């Protein structure tokens, strides 16, 4: 004879969370809050380009090291790009006090 039943959804899915009372807990649908990924690029903000040094230090950039392109046309930019170990420090060495402070002032 006739019957009525409740119903709800399942699917083929096997995506999982952690939860208070059980782990790897499977659900139908999920959403990742996280961005665990990076494109592996140096893109630019907004249409505003960044500054690039290539091999140079900030000393070689600001002072006018001839092997560093001065690039006066670079009037403003999005962010500064270095490497960790900048090749071209000062050709005639010398202490450069408050490197920290100058960098922080030239954050932006």
């Amino acid at each position: 004879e006739d019957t009525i039943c409740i119903g709800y959804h399942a699917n083929n899915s096997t995506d999982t969370v952690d939860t208070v009372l059980e782990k790897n807990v499977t659900v139908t649908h999920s959403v990742n809050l996280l961005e665990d990924s990076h494109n592996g690029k140096l893109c630019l903000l907004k249409g505003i380009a960044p500054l690039q040094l290539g091999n140079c230090s900030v000393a070689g950039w600001i002072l006018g090291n001839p092997e560093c392109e001065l690039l006066i046309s670079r009037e403003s930019w999005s962010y500064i790009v270095e490497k960790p170990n900048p090749e071209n420090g000062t050709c005639y060495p010398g202490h450069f006090a408050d490197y920290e402070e100058l960098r922080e002032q030239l954050s932006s």
């Binding site: 019957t3 039943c5 709800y8 959804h9 939860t19 208070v20 920290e100 960098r103 922080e104």
Partner: protein, 173 residues
């Protein structure tokens, strides 16, 4: 089945239907079929919309610059700024992780709640006219067509429609 259904009196889910997260399964002489409850389903999903908007939006992400650097005569400030940043990092980490755990629990309870509510709504029409069976389902001492199905979906039955047929077909049991 916090509140008694899902791994409760119900054991498992169904892959037959995909149009909505909730519904009914109708069974009568014309055939069987699954059919989704877009009313309560859409209301709940609107709740999830307001949730996730009310999680994402509650940040304010500044036009930020993180990093700093120091010489080796600034080690006060180095171990500070490390302690500072690691403190903040850990606090966002801890609070957000707990928030994912708790919010997903409350989401499970929200769903469980909604189906339990609907289960009582199904019960409330058909109390003596049709019986609890097994789990998940009710059997009718009378018969029901697709009009009777869609009527019972939207919260309508006409209680005296088959009150007498249940009054007779009960009485062999």
């Amino acid at each position: 089945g916090l509140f008694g259904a899902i791994a409760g009196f119900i054991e498992g889910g169904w892959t037959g239907m995909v149009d909505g997260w909730y519904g009914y399964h109708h069974q009568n002489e014309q055939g069987s079929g699954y059919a989704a409850d877009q009313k309560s389903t859409q209301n709940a999903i609107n709740g999830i919309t307001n949730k996730v908007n009310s999680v994402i939006e509650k940040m304010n992400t500044q036009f930020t610059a993180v990093g700093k650097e120091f010489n080796k005569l600034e080690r006060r400030m180095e171990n500070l700024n490390k302690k500072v940043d690691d403190g903040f990092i850990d606090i966002w980490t801890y609070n957000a992780e707990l928030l994912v755990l708790l919010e997903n629990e409350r989401t499970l309870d929200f769903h469980d709640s909604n189906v339990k509510n609907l289960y009582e709504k199904v019960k409330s029409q058909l109390k003596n006219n049709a019986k609890e069976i097994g789990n998940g389902c009710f059997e009718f001492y009378h018969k029901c067509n697709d009009e009777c199905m869609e009527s019972v979906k939207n919260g309508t039955y006409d209680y005296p429609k088959y009150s007498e047929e249940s009054k007779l077909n009960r009485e062999k049991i």
